[PDB]
Amino acid sequence: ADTIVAVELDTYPNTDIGDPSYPHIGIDIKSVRSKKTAKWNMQNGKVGTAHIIYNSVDKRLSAVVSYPNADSATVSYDVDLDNVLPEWVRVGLSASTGLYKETNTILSWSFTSKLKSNSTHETNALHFMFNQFSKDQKDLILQGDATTGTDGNLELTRVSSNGSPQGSSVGRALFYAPVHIWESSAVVASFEATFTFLIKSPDSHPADGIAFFISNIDSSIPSGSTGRLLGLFPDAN
Amino acid sequence: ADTIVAVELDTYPNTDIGDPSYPHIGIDIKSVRSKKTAKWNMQNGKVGTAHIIYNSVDKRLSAVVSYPNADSATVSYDVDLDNVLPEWVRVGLSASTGLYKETNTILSWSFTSKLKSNSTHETNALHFMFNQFSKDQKDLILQGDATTGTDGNLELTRVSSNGSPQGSSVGRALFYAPVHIWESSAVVASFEATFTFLIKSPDSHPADGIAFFISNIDSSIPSGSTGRLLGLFPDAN
Amino acid sequence: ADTIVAVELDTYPNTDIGDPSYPHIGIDIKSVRSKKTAKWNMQNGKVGTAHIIYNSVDKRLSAVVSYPNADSATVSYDVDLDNVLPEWVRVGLSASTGLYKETNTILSWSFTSKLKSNSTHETNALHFMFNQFSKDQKDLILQGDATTGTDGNLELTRVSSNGSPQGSSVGRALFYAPVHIWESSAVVASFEATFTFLIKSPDSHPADGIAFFISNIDSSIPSGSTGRLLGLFPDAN
Amino acid sequence: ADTIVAVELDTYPNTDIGDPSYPHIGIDIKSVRSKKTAKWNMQNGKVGTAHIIYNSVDKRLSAVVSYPNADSATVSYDVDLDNVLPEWVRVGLSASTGLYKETNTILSWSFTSKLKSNSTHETNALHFMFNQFSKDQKDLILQGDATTGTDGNLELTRVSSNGSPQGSSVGRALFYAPVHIWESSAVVASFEATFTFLIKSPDSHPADGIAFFISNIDSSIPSGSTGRLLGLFPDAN
Ligand SMILES: O=C(NCCOCCO[C@H]1O[C@H](CO)[C@@H](O)[C@H](O)[C@@H]1O)c1ccc2ccc3ccc(C(=O)NCCOCCO[C@H]4O[C@H](CO)[C@@H](O)[C@H](O)[C@@H]4O)nc3c2n1
Ligand SMILES: O=C(NCCOCCO[C@H]1O[C@H](CO)[C@@H](O)[C@H](O)[C@@H]1O)c1ccc2ccc3ccc(C(=O)NCCOCCO[C@H]4O[C@H](CO)[C@@H](O)[C@H](O)[C@@H]4O)nc3c2n1
Ligand SMILES: [Ca+2]
Ligand SMILES: [Ca+2]
Ligand SMILES: [Ca+2]
Ligand SMILES: [Ca+2]
Ligand SMILES: [Mn+2]
Ligand SMILES: [Mn+2]
Ligand SMILES: [Mn+2]
Ligand SMILES: [Mn+2]
């Protein structure tokens, strides 16, 4: 179908598809089946920050989610992304809900990808940063339930006007421009993505999470991906 | 029609529309009629570098074209670009020929725009750099005669396979993503664009030039803009 | 008589040396008397942001001070800094109180310097940023009363443990490294600086101010410079 | 016994201290004997590029050396540098010859250091770049035989006016400022370095090599370090 690499933040365990029985962060390579996961003491109603980072050299893909004044969960998995991904991709943030529900507000999102070549400073590069989202973001492709303008914030999931979240929503947000993520002849290729989010839920149990993801250029939301699939994968299979 | 701000490099004087009688650089605000110009000792067959820079603070738009081991022509004109331009634009390089002809090879092109807001480091930003152009550039919108892949270079104007240029060509190249160039509430807005080019002509007199330009999102090439209009303006009027 | 260039922020108008009546920002090029100024609707106890930007192309030095939800005071002055300044400088911040007094608290400070040249981005550069000041900052030079570590802030003037400002206080903080501020052979020579500050006085009347300055590598506080001279100038010439 | 971490590039294998037979690159963590290495198909007289990249999340230090149109030699090592290194270091380059000798010419060198934290990009950072070395570089610390200004290059080992390398030579160059390399409270602590170099010997056999190193602020050349120790380590322990 469409190739998907993503870093997932399960607020909701899904022991039927494999997810551990605790709020976790994890690395998904073409399958909601995480190839590596780590325990995340999630904080309800607090603004937190995720850093994603990968370099050709280590071939190690990494992520750190962390709150102020709080321990930070980290995950790392050796993968070679030119085998996996197409030469041109498009990056973005995705998030969704199920029975249980949560606010998936993205307060800020940045990202940087460099292609340093065999001759140095013959590099190629793209960096893009949002610390507030305007009422109309010409350069974000918004998919599903995604809405901007609410308090200068990106809401990937749907929320009622009073501020309570709603269930069984998928919204997904993408950068307008395609990213040349890797090349046949580059000595180092790298890419970092940082984004801060606010997850607050009225219910004691929230669901399902946020994921930063990378896919081929022409990606649209999978049918019936609402819930534990996070708007990234069509099937747990 | 479509609003156009651009820095022009006339290799060919056009004294019928106003252009001075020497190879010049100049500032065009919605009219091929340059509002300020400066003398440029152009160098045939040598790689040269243009720097464009503008900040909300000075409200002064500036450009410098310069060769290695050679004097550098500079131009500057006070303009306030939120009055002129739409809130969202799209940037790019344009170039064309007439009776006389030239190669308009773009060896590299970068650009950066920042929106620092009334609260600091609540900024918004986009930077993008090409030091080589691949056979297929997914993220460049190519218009008219524009072609990439030839020796890792962007050729805005048409060129025969042996390497000689051809006449009465317009090619124009644009960044896929729209640039949020200014905002109603930002204490400093700024944007810098740098690009290196190679102009070589078999004929003693070459024509017409290269221009970096900014326009509304939906800009396409004007009809009959080939020649002294540089693929930017429909009429000298 | 070390050479010194600066962007000053006067909370105290010293009418005999030329300070306008109203609290102003100004450009001080080699003398305390400001070459140009602009009215500044200062806000007591609110954090503000200073932006400062100059480049070899415009040859305009300029600056904007700005509080949230309030107009921003701006100023510009056409000056060629390679005439005025040595080839190699140190950059830094200064502030001072006299009979009247204020809290000169620096919350954050960053600075960029590029020497782009004729070739394909064969430039020389330096950038540094502080959103928190550590308890021992060994890459700042601390001069006078200046202190770090309290709340992660830089305090250029002396304050009590309760927080009360003191009178007749003078403090400077310089980046440890020397900056290559201009070159004989570089086609453009941009440099940008940004910083935030907190100014609060119990008093009806606060004094004197903060200034971003640039001077020689060997620069030290001029004697008897507390008060009107902001730790910058020996005399009021 | 100053503390020191480094990425070494051996043209001369010193088999008794563990250098493999073949010319190698390696990670030297607190001792000259390399913790891990990889074969390097060195090219005489051709400029090459070294890339070096480490981050607190992976906790992997790694590096790639690369010539145009040739495979690139790579190496990695899992090490937690805040255990090994002091909180505040200086970075720099070192190289040396012994009985056998080579030209250790540094054409260009850049370095980035970020201390991203838990908050919304409230980080601390430093970046610097050199594509040309000036005649007097007063923000490099020059140690040993190291010299600037010849062709705009850095020469870490001594060379004649004709260009002939010399034997038993040792040279280091450090950035003037101290780097905050890690923090107790920072959630990630990335740092990246890049540099190009020219290595040429008249001989069949060249020696010894160049190394990027990190050490304490007060670090100076260890005595008797020419030859195998590359200006880095007092002893071969
Ligand atoms: O008004 C006072 N007693 C009378 C004489 O003090 C001069 C001010 O009175 C002014 O009005 C009087 C009435 O017409 C005149 O008789 C004076 O000749 C003067 O013009 C007086 C009473 C208490 C004081 C306590 C601590 C102090 C520390 C330093 C200075 C000083 O060196 N101060 C020197 C003089 O005071 C102002 C200088 O300003 C200084 O302090 C300012 C504080 O903002 C700075 O802006 C400025 O750069 C200077 O450093 N002063 C005091 C001080 N002065
Ligand atoms: O081979 C020579 N004459 C014989 C004795 O020289 C030792 C090498 O001969 C080797 O083989 C011989 C035959 O089996 C043995 O009898 C020796 O005991 C030794 O193992 C000889 C002839 C001329 C010389 C001229 C200038 C010099 C400067 C310094 C040194 C030195 O300190 N040199 C010390 C010894 O030479 C190698 C050290 O390598 C040094 O130089 C290398 C150059 O790459 C570095 O890699 C390395 O780290 C060292 O600094 N040597 C010379 C030197 N040596
Ligand atoms: Ca889940
Ligand atoms: Ca023309
Ligand atoms: Ca004053
Ligand atoms: Ca060796
Ligand atoms: Mn899952
Ligand atoms: Mn014209
Ligand atoms: Mn003043
Ligand atoms: Mn070795």
Coordinates of C-alpha atoms in Angstrom, one line a residue, chain B residues 1-229:
Chain B
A1 CA -3.2 40.1 -12.0
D2 CA -0.5 38.3 -9.9
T3 CA 1.7 40.4 -7.6
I4 CA 5.4 40.2 -8.3
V5 CA 8.3 41.4 -6.3
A6 CA 11.7 40.4 -7.8
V7 CA 15.4 41.3 -8.0
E8 CA 16.3 41.5 -11.7
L9 CA 19.7 41.0 -13.4
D10 CA 19.4 42.6 -16.9
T11 CA 22.3 41.4 -19.0
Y12 CA 20.5 43.3 -21.9
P13 CA 19.6 47.0 -21.7
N14 CA 16.1 47.8 -22.8
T15 CA 16.1 51.6 -23.2
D16 CA 12.5 51.5 -24.7
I17 CA 11.0 50.3 -21.3
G18 CA 13.5 52.3 -19.1
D19 CA 16.3 49.8 -18.4
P20 CA 19.7 51.7 -18.3
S21 CA 22.2 51.2 -21.1
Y22 CA 24.4 48.8 -19.3
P23 CA 24.1 45.3 -17.6
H24 CA 22.4 46.2 -14.3
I25 CA 20.8 44.7 -11.2
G26 CA 17.6 46.1 -10.0
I27 CA 14.5 46.0 -7.8
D28 CA 11.1 45.4 -9.4
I29 CA 7.9 46.1 -7.4
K30 CA 4.8 45.0 -9.6
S31 CA 6.4 46.5 -12.8
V32 CA 9.4 45.5 -15.0
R33 CA 10.1 49.1 -14.3
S34 CA 12.9 48.9 -11.8
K35 CA 12.5 51.3 -8.9
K36 CA 16.3 51.3 -8.3
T37 CA 19.1 50.0 -10.4
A38 CA 22.9 49.7 -10.2
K39 CA 25.7 49.0 -12.7
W40 CA 26.9 45.4 -12.9
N41 CA 30.1 44.5 -14.8
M42 CA 28.8 41.1 -15.8
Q43 CA 31.3 38.3 -16.5
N44 CA 30.6 35.9 -19.3
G45 CA 31.3 32.3 -18.6
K46 CA 32.1 32.6 -15.0
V47 CA 30.1 31.4 -12.0
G48 CA 28.7 34.2 -9.9
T49 CA 26.7 34.6 -6.7
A50 CA 23.6 36.7 -5.9
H51 CA 22.5 37.5 -2.3
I52 CA 19.1 38.9 -1.6
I53 CA 18.1 40.1 1.9
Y54 CA 15.3 42.0 3.5
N55 CA 14.1 42.6 7.1
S56 CA 11.0 44.2 8.6
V57 CA 13.2 46.5 10.6
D58 CA 15.1 48.5 8.0
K59 CA 12.3 48.0 5.6
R60 CA 15.2 48.0 3.1
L61 CA 15.3 45.4 0.3
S62 CA 18.8 44.6 -0.9
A63 CA 20.8 42.5 -3.4
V64 CA 24.5 41.9 -4.2
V65 CA 25.8 40.2 -7.3
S66 CA 29.5 39.3 -7.3
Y67 CA 32.1 37.2 -8.9
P68 CA 35.3 35.8 -7.4
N69 CA 38.2 38.3 -7.7
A70 CA 35.8 40.9 -9.0
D71 CA 33.9 44.0 -7.9
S72 CA 30.4 43.5 -6.6
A73 CA 27.4 45.5 -7.7
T74 CA 24.8 46.3 -5.0
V75 CA 21.2 47.7 -5.0
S76 CA 18.9 48.8 -2.2
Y77 CA 15.4 50.3 -2.1
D78 CA 13.2 51.1 0.9
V79 CA 9.9 49.1 0.5
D80 CA 7.3 47.8 2.9
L81 CA 6.4 44.4 1.5
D82 CA 3.3 43.6 3.6
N83 CA 1.5 46.5 1.8
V84 CA 2.7 45.1 -1.6
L85 CA 2.5 41.2 -1.2
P86 CA -0.1 38.8 0.0
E87 CA 0.3 37.2 3.5
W88 CA 1.2 33.9 1.8
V89 CA 3.4 33.7 -1.2
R90 CA 5.7 31.4 -3.1
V91 CA 9.3 32.1 -4.1
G92 CA 11.5 31.1 -7.0
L93 CA 13.9 31.8 -9.7
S94 CA 12.9 33.0 -13.2
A95 CA 14.9 33.6 -16.4
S96 CA 14.5 34.1 -20.1
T97 CA 15.9 35.1 -23.5
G98 CA 15.0 37.1 -26.6
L99 CA 16.7 37.7 -29.9
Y100 CA 19.9 37.4 -28.2
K101 CA 20.5 34.3 -26.1
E102 CA 22.4 32.9 -23.1
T103 CA 22.7 30.0 -20.8
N104 CA 20.9 30.5 -17.5
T105 CA 22.3 27.7 -15.4
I106 CA 21.5 27.8 -11.7
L107 CA 24.2 25.9 -9.9
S108 CA 22.8 26.3 -6.3
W109 CA 19.9 28.1 -4.6
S110 CA 19.0 28.6 -0.9
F111 CA 16.6 30.7 1.1
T112 CA 15.4 31.4 4.7
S113 CA 12.4 33.3 6.0
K114 CA 11.7 33.8 9.7
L115 CA 8.7 35.4 11.6
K116 CA 9.9 36.3 15.0
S117 CA 6.9 37.3 17.1
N118 CA 6.2 39.9 19.8
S119 CA 7.1 37.2 22.3
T120 CA 10.7 36.0 21.4
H121 CA 11.5 32.5 20.3
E122 CA 7.8 32.0 19.4
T123 CA 9.2 32.4 15.8
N124 CA 8.1 30.6 12.6
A125 CA 10.5 29.5 9.9
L126 CA 11.5 27.7 6.7
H127 CA 15.0 27.2 5.1
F128 CA 15.7 25.3 2.0
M129 CA 19.1 24.7 0.2
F130 CA 20.0 23.0 -3.1
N131 CA 23.7 22.6 -4.0
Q132 CA 22.9 20.1 -6.7
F133 CA 19.6 19.4 -8.6
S134 CA 18.6 15.8 -9.2
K135 CA 17.0 14.4 -12.4
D136 CA 13.6 14.7 -10.7
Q137 CA 13.1 17.4 -8.1
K138 CA 9.8 16.6 -6.5
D139 CA 9.8 19.8 -4.5
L140 CA 10.5 22.3 -7.3
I141 CA 7.5 23.5 -9.4
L142 CA 9.0 23.8 -12.9
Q143 CA 7.4 26.2 -15.3
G144 CA 8.0 26.8 -19.0
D145 CA 11.3 25.6 -20.3
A146 CA 12.8 24.7 -17.0
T147 CA 14.8 21.4 -16.8
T148 CA 16.9 19.7 -14.1
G149 CA 19.4 16.8 -14.2
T150 CA 21.9 18.2 -16.7
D151 CA 25.2 17.9 -14.8
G152 CA 23.3 18.3 -11.5
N153 CA 22.2 21.8 -12.5
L154 CA 19.0 23.8 -13.0
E155 CA 18.6 25.2 -16.4
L156 CA 15.9 27.8 -16.4
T157 CA 16.4 28.6 -20.1
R158 CA 16.4 26.0 -22.9
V159 CA 19.8 24.8 -24.3
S160 CA 20.6 22.4 -27.1
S161 CA 22.3 19.1 -26.3
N162 CA 25.7 20.2 -27.6
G163 CA 25.7 23.0 -25.0
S164 CA 24.8 26.1 -27.1
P165 CA 21.9 28.2 -25.8
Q166 CA 18.6 28.8 -27.7
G167 CA 16.5 32.0 -28.1
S168 CA 13.1 33.2 -27.0
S169 CA 12.9 30.8 -24.0
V170 CA 11.3 31.4 -20.6
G171 CA 11.7 28.9 -17.8
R172 CA 10.7 29.4 -14.3
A173 CA 11.3 27.4 -11.1
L174 CA 9.4 27.6 -7.8
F175 CA 9.4 26.0 -4.4
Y176 CA 6.6 23.5 -3.9
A177 CA 5.6 24.9 -0.4
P178 CA 4.0 28.3 0.1
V179 CA 6.0 30.7 2.3
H180 CA 4.3 32.6 5.0
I181 CA 6.1 35.7 4.2
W182 CA 4.6 38.2 6.6
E183 CA 2.0 38.3 9.4
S184 CA -0.3 40.8 11.0
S185 CA 1.5 40.6 14.4
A186 CA 5.3 39.9 14.1
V187 CA 7.9 42.3 15.4
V188 CA 10.5 41.3 12.9
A189 CA 10.0 39.5 9.5
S190 CA 12.9 38.7 7.3
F191 CA 14.0 36.5 4.4
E192 CA 17.3 35.9 2.7
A193 CA 17.9 34.1 -0.6
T194 CA 21.2 33.2 -2.1
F195 CA 21.9 31.5 -5.5
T196 CA 24.8 31.0 -7.8
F197 CA 24.5 31.0 -11.5
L198 CA 26.5 30.6 -14.7
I199 CA 25.9 32.9 -17.6
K200 CA 27.9 32.1 -20.8
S201 CA 26.9 33.3 -24.3
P202 CA 28.3 32.4 -27.7
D203 CA 27.2 35.8 -29.0
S204 CA 29.1 39.0 -27.8
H205 CA 25.7 40.4 -26.6
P206 CA 23.6 38.1 -24.3
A207 CA 20.0 38.5 -23.1
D208 CA 18.1 39.0 -21.0
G209 CA 18.8 37.8 -17.5
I210 CA 17.9 36.0 -14.3
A211 CA 15.6 37.1 -11.5
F212 CA 14.7 35.8 -8.1
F213 CA 11.1 36.6 -7.5
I214 CA 8.2 36.3 -5.0
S215 CA 4.6 36.1 -6.0
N216 CA 1.2 35.0 -4.8
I217 CA 0.7 31.3 -4.4
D218 CA -1.1 30.5 -7.7
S219 CA 1.4 32.3 -10.1
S220 CA 1.9 30.9 -13.6
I221 CA 4.0 32.3 -16.5
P222 CA 2.5 35.4 -18.2
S223 CA 1.5 35.1 -21.9
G224 CA 4.1 36.6 -24.2
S225 CA 6.5 37.3 -21.3
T226 CA 9.5 35.9 -23.3
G227 CA 12.3 38.3 -23.7
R228 CA 12.8 41.6 -21.7
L229 CA 9.9 40.7 -19.4

